[PDB]
Amino acid sequence: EIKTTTTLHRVVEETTKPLGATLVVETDISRKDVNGLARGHLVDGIPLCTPSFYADIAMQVGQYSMQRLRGLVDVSDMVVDKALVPHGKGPQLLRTTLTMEWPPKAAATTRSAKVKFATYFKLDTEHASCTVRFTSDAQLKSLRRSVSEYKTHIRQLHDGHAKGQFMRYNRKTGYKLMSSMARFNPDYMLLDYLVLNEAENEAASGVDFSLGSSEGTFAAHPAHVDAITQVAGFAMNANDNVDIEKQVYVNHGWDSFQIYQPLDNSKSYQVYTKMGQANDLVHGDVVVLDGEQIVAFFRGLTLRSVPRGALRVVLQT
Amino acid sequence: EIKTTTTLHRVVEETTKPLGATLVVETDISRKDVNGLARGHLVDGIPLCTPSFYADIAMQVGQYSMQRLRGLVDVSDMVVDKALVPHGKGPQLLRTTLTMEWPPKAAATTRSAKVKFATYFKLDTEHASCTVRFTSDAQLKSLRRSVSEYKTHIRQLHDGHAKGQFMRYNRKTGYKLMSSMARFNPDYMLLDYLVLNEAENEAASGVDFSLGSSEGTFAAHPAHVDAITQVAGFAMNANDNVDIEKQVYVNHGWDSFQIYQPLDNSKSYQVYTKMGQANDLVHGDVVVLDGEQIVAFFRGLTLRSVPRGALRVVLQT
Numbered sequence A, B: 001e002i003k004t005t006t007t008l009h010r011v012v013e014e015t016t017k018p019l020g021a022t023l024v025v026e027t028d029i030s031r032k033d034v035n036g037l038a039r040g041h042l043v044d045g046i047p048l049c050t051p052s053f054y055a056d057i058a059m060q061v062g063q064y065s066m067q068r069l070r071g072l073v074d075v076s077d078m079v080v081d082k083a084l085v086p087h088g089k090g091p092q093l094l095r096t097t098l099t100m101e102w103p104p105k106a107a108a109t110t111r112s113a114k115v116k117f118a119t120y121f122k123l124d125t126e127h128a129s130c131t132v133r134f135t136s137d138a139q140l141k142s143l144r145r146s147v148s149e150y151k152t153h154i155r156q157l158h159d160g161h162a163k164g165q166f167m168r169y170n171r172k173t174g175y176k177l178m179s180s181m182a183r184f185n186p187d188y189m190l191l192d193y194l195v196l197n198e199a200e201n202e203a204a205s206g207v208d209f210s211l212g213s214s215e216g217t218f219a220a221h222p223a224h225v226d227a228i229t230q231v232a233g234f235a236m237n238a239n240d241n242v243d244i245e246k247q248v249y250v251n252h253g254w255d256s257f258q259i260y261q262p263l264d265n266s267k268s269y270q271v272y273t274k275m276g277q278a279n280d281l282v283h284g285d286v287v288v289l290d291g292e293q294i295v296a297f298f299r300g301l302t303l304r305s306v307p308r309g310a311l312r313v314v315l316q317t
């Protein structure tokens, strides 16, 4: 039976059939243990749930599904369509629906599940979707072979900063730079330092989970995983040629997300990304290291350029 | 008779006397050539006239007063008491009142005049005051002897940045850093780069007056002089330990201000300040160089720590 957590509160429905299964879980984002955490970012005084919030729940229903059938869960094909504003005024029910389909009777052969995230009063808004994948360790093995190359990019960023070539932002100064666009729940302000090579939207950052409070139970703490994606959002938005009064880069989702080691709330990690240039979309990979160890990887993290002013409008609509 | 300019529109009253004289001038800050200029900073969508606007008028009425009795005018003892919001909705008449006092027949020996700045509809608000002084060149001579020393502080700041010790902000990134506190009329965005030693609130900045448009006639262009004081305000507000969502440093005035060379709108200048350490107030000197030449100097520029939120309240009321 699925363990309830800070971010997954009850099972609404759990049905097996011959050609598939449906699992519906529910999270009251107004519940007092989670409401604070659900309010990750703040834009024009409007609180916003981060994609990492869905990713946590996805990892949970995926891990459960994968164990129930028989291993790494990949939160893949994440698409964030509509803002979720945790109002904190009476129940606000986020329903996460996981569906699986199969041949008879190869249920145990199943390597993916479709996941949808929608708030209910019933239906309020459909927010996001992803596909969880029960994946191989092939990527992990490949990442392990590239560790030394990632470490080299990181070292070269620090060397450049030490020569006056690249900007290095202390934690509070980085958040100040972003503050006309978004403010952050303090528990999400986990970027300790960030070195940015603006020419390639390329960043090396120390993320220190000890800098926030992360009480509760999770598969992947939404603050910890949002801090990882913040590094790529900062690389884009902190470029001297991006005028954040007019245009801002927002997280649209990603192609793949795997976690290989605990995201420990007493530890700091190294995060490296080269986003680059590219319609209204940029994409790139984000790796998380713990010294020599591969901790996590976003493949094809996607940020969308949106008008600052029209963002304001839609969020107030 | 006093030359009218972009920032001084008409003489309201001009009386000489046995024991002194009164000169009252008027500037309609809604007039189309000046209204843009008058709106130098923007806080919470509220436009604000900068202290440099009063300093320009002070130099003009001071130079005139000095010339008509019988070379440097010092805009000294500047105190900025109340915000001036150029609404641009019908006339908004800034009245600058200069008063002088003297012995019988000794008018020619007069070395200072009291200046007050108040808007009228009639009395609206009293904004600021200063004392213009007809001063010696002793300070100028002293500054010329320190040139090499100022240049050394500047070179040391650049050296430190080249070793990764001090922050260097490109123009647009500096203004992005300040943007949750204030936005700036583009004609005021003249800070080309700034290197900051946060430990001592110590900055060297290139200010490039060619970066804005400054059409009109002035004694000292309000954008150009404000850009000089921005270097000190930035030094304080860009400190990692100053949370601009809570407290901001605002210009309160200064003890002395002298200009020794034209502030040429095609030229860039070097500005150096060491504000140092946080009562309500910080103070320090700001020097302006053009290579080897002394161009201008604020002695005892004063910034006041004000609550960001309570700043908002007052301005909105």
Ligand SMILES: COc1cc(O)c2c(O)c(C(C)=O)c(CC(C)=O)cc2c1
Pocket: A041, A043, A048, A049, A050, A051, A080, A081, A082, A083, A084, A182, A249, A250, A251, A306, A310, A311, A314, A315
């Ligand atoms: C206008 O469309 C959207 C939709 C979203 O889901 C959005 C969203 O989730 C966010 C979030 C979570 O931050 C933002 C603002 C940022 C990047 O800080 C803006 C959004 C804007």
Ligand SMILES: COc1cc(O)c2c(O)c(C(C)=O)c(CC(C)=O)cc2c1
Pocket: B041, B042, B043, B048, B049, B050, B051, B080, B081, B082, B083, B084, B181, B182, B249, B250, B251, B306, B310, B311, B314, B315
């Ligand atoms: C609350 O009291 C004041 C009085 C002023 O005259 C103020 C003032 O002139 C200003 C400005 C800009 O001129 C400001 C805001 C800043 C530093 O950008 C804030 C002010 C705040």
